[PDB]
Design a protein around this ligand. Sequence first.
Ligand SMILES: O=c1ccn([C@@H]2O[C@H](COP(=O)(O)OP(=O)(O)O)[C@@H](O)[C@H]2O)c(=O)[nH]1
Ligand SMILES: O=c1ccn([C@@H]2O[C@H](COP(=O)(O)OP(=O)(O)O)[C@@H](O)[C@H]2O)c(=O)[nH]1
Lengths: 365, 373
Amino acid sequence: MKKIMTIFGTRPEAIKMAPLVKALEQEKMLEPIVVVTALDSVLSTFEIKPKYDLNTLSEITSKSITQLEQVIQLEKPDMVLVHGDTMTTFAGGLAAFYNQVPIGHVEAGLRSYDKYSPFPEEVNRQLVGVLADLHFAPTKNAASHLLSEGKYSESVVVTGNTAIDAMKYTVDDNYKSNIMDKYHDKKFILMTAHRRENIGKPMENIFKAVRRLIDEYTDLALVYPMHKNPKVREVAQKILGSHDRIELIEPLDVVDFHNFAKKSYFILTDSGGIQEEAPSFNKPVLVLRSVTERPEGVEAGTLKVIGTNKQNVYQAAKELIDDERLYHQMSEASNPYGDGFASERIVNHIKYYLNLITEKPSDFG
Amino acid sequence: MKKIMTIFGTRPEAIKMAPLVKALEQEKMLEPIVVVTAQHREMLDSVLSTFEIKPKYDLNIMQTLSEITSKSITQLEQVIQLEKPDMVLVHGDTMTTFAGGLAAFYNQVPIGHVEAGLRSYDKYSPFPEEVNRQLVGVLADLHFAPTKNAASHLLSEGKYSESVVVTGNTAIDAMKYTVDDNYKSNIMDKYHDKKFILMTAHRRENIGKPMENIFKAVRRLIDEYTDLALVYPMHKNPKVREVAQKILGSHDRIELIEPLDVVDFHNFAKKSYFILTDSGGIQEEAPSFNKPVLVLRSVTERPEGVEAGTLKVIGTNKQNVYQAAKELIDDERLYHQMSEASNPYGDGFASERIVNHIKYYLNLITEKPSDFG
Ligand SMILES: O=c1ccn([C@@H]2O[C@H](COP(=O)(O)OP(=O)(O)O)[C@@H](O)[C@H]2O)c(=O)[nH]1
Ligand SMILES: O=c1ccn([C@@H]2O[C@H](COP(=O)(O)OP(=O)(O)O)[C@@H](O)[C@H]2O)c(=O)[nH]1
């Protein structure tokens, strides 16, 4: 009945938007129109078929704006939903605004308050914050950023992060894997590293710290689904290669990654999405960054921001291994990012906003 | 020297940026690189000749709002990468302002926002200007706020304290260049025995009935008051002109004319009885001419002139426009209250303050200018 356009252009966004597309599909009064800019394995896992598959930073924005406008004018959606902070999020929000279509921002209000870090993500989410009619903040902290900036009180709602909802479709407590069977008698670290700010010396530092832990603790193993970057793979192979307790593998599909994460000892990562998922797996996370836009997990105790200095990475992981009570406290901390029903809240906020229902959902929480 | 790129694309924007380009020219340590995008093409040239400015780049851009933005960002990036400016200056809230600010940001060039912080706090009014100035507020490194009220909007939104500076509006600086001692006009001479209303209206007012309402209210005042006249420099839009002709045409004491060059418009505004307009720029200039303004907008981002007393916001309802104008005509005390009010928008030296803030920011000078106000 009411057309809800969902625009997304990356695999991490597809994971976060997929459960919302399923909730919009299940809702009788709303019809989702899926637009991919833009991944295929995520779309098949959640059984989503895009209606549109489109397809310098200036050229990306320029092309995205005009093509998304063509799709918006053809479909005439009642609302456009954009996610987070990528080039597509801003281009989709701006094309919607120019066509006077209401905008819902999924995962609204994250802030580093530094224009050049993350670049261009910090500016993208701040620019979308200007356009959006509804801000689906994942946490009360993100909602406070928007309320303090002067966004209208009633337009800011706390729903939780849809990353936790996606886990309901992927986790299988009877999951099977030959790599997991190989390390049945080991405690494995699950590591991922993709941030441009960690290319070069940060990566060498991280790998030497992890290699030292692998040498010192014989019952430890490492599973590292590596980004395809040839330089980082060369560096990974020199420090971490030819070791039977280290698995240097390709990126995992989301079913395999979530099930690996659920069996890991702890996670080492610079990922934003893994920080929101990890507390629901009861897995401590050591965040390989110097600044965070997810302080909620730090306050809850689920994560610890350790930077990329070789000594700090090594010492922080060693403390997690040696102090079982600290490990258990980080594992048991509740997820401040959601309870798995963010999509249902978002759907009911959309219905309320479009005058299809009288009840407005309460803030998650 | 440092390269200061000044990007602007419309005649109103050229009027406000021209005195700043002249101050950047006069400044020994800075070089202005003038980039014009020409959404307004013909009228933009007479502004450039009045102030003696020759653009280094003249891009042909100018179509949906998406297409304008899409074309402007890539072409302005090409100019930014070729020139490698030390700072990009954008003005106000047009499509060029945002596209130039975004291309500068993607190339990590510092951004100075001339006329920063105006807010209606309504996403669809002015559309797309309110959103454009809010989007540029996210990108800018220096916010040259025209008034303390505009600076308060930026400070309340969380912009860094030292990045927000009050300079006054460059619209008042431009009026120093539009004085013509040998000024004459045959239209003014024809109405030497009349009190004329000077009216201007944007093309967007003709989407729905606002323009028709305004014109019927004004025609009624011309019919009722024989000593009144109307001077209306019309946008070229054929649809605007059909509606003007159909309501205000074939009428004694009404001049339906072409857009005026800025020297004539400023000199017509000084001899008018009062101004009837939806213009943003005229609201900032009018107090310096001691002229009352009836603002044809439902929401304003210029409350300073309302507080000072030169401006009254009256909307576009036919009865309200007619009653508000009739009250100005009948109540000489109220006309006097709106006339003698001081200008809260500037003193004519905003450009010098902007230039010294730029020098300070790029570490060329130690003194930071004080806040105008
Ligand atoms: O090999 C991998 C690594 C990550 N993930 C998932 O991808 C998201 C995180 O993506 P990434 O770290 O690349 O991006 P970020 O979240 O930092 O933007 C989370 O949902 C992870 O569970 C995945 O499916 N396979
Ligand atoms: O025929 C005209 C009408 C206006 N102006 C000037 O143009 C600016 C206002 O332009 P406009 O109202 O079209 O745009 P706005 O300010 O509303 O964006 C002010 O400097 C006016 O003095 C002009 O030179 N000639």
